[PDB]
Amino acid sequence: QVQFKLVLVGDGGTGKTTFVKRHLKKYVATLGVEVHPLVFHTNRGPIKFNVWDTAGQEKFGGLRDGYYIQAQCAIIMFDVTSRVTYKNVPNWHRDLVRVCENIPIVLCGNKVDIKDRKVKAKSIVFHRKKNLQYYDISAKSNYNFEKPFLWLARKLIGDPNLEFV
Amino acid sequence: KVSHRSHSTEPGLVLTLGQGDVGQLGLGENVMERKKPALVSIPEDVVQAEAGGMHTVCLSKSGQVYSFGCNDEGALGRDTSVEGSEMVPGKVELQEKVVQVSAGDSHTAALTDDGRVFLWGSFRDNNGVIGLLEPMKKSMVPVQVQLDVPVVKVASGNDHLVMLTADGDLYTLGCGEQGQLGRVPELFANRGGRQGLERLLVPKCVMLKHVRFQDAFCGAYFTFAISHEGHVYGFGLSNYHQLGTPGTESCFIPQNLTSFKNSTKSWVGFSGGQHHTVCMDSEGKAYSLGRAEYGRLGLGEGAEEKSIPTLISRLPAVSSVACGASVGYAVTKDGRVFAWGMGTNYQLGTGQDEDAWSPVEMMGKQLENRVVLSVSSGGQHTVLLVKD
Known about the structure:
The structure holds 2 protein chains of 2 kinds.
Chain A: E1 2-10, H1 16-21, E2 27-30, E3 33-40, E4 47-53, H2 57-60, E5 73-79, H3 89-100, E6 105-110, H4 124-127, E7 133-137, H5 147-157
Parallel strand pairs in A: 1-4, 1-5, 5-6, 6-7
Antiparallel strand pairs in A: 2-3, 3-4
Chain B: E1 13-19, E2 33-40, E3 46-51, E4 55-60, E5 65-69, E6 90-91, E7 98-103, E8 107-112, E9 117-121, E10 123-125, E11 128-131, E12 139-145, E13 151-156, E14 160-165, E15 170-174, H1 198-201, E16 204-205, E17 213-218, E18 222-227, E19 232-237, E20 250-256, E21 267-272, E22 276-281, E23 286-290, E24 306-311, E25 318-323, E26 327-332, E27 337-341, E28 356-361, E29 371-377, E30 381-387
Antiparallel strand pairs in B: 1-2, 1-30, 3-4, 4-5, 5-6, 7-8, 8-9, 9-12, 10-11, 13-14, 14-15, 15-16, 17-18, 18-19, 19-20, 21-22, 22-23, 23-24, 25-26, 26-27, 27-28, 29-30
């Protein structure tokens, strides 16, 4: 059975909890961090992502590299409608590469403030760049909610033709 | 009326470097990055230039405030409806003579010449926006903090504000989740607990059996305060020993930091990023403590986590120090500026993005024939105030 440890990091209030909830039991693998196993059925068999919702512990806790060790992939999330949440992206990115090396990482721009249709201007800055794979997502119509997982799954399995069923 | 040694009065020019994705460089709609100090155009001479997490606030010689950067939470304190307006300096409508400003991640504070404090933007905690002065409510415009005593200094962490009064009392407000307010029990750390946010957002005094203070400083999630007697007190986050050896990862009760017990030493300045602290004494020596990764301690390669202030030897006499999220700076008595730490965001001014485990002198066209007056750094950018 295919299983992967996925680290989910991001500022508080960026929709990390809601994001996970919608793809649903949970368990504690350590202090202040719940792990939520998510199973996706695909044309290559079931794939399970054990999502660690660090919940800011990487900033305030004491496990040090423990939060990231053995992670096979990661999702960095921020709020495209409150861009100060992008502040720590470089630090999270550096730490993930330092502790895990070249693991696949997806950057997710969540539109938390679902009341202002000029997010196609606040987000344009992130489609650019290129170092990390970026996706616009939003709690509401679960827009692209599966995209990050699909991209990671393809990279992890090494199958560009992988599809979720 | 009010005065404090921390107030700046020497007119200078503002330079910025680093990332500018959201306008924090103040160089226009298409300048997203500057590897070397770049001149920011302001209509007047500037006496203070502060870097918030993702925004910049400058104070003019006449007492007018200018801002640029991310205004999603109201941090700029001005209308940025017009596309691109947040990417260049813009005036903050405040008919007051401001003498000092401070900036956090989503808030900005301004101190008037008569001791009144104006604040705008919002504070955030580990669950999102908690409000500014009223629960769950940010302010896009300057609002006065209600206090019946004159304030002489304002200082900001990422999401908390500290105000030193003319009498030596220290008032704090904002997020207290890590103990950085020094007046809230761990039991009420999470949004005030059952009693709610009111307790966190209303300015209240730091009460210690009472001790008065002559200065105060803020790291990202912790606070340092120097008592009238010269003793160093700290509270807030210390998971990487940023406060020394408080004995806990979150220090809610203000503590006379043993790691800073002098005798012949007089601590005069403190600064801090997320996981490190840089301080200086009355003799112009700089010290660092906390997490060592990416060289943020400036103690050379191979450096390891420190729980006591450790001397940064590769530095000339220092006049001031500052910290970015993962970088450190020191301005020398002779007007030069040194930098060290994570180089990823181009905050070092070396021209390269490689980390610097030892202090490196910043050089560049905009620094030629000029002396550095001050340095302030945010999450991905840095701001310098220079003079010819």
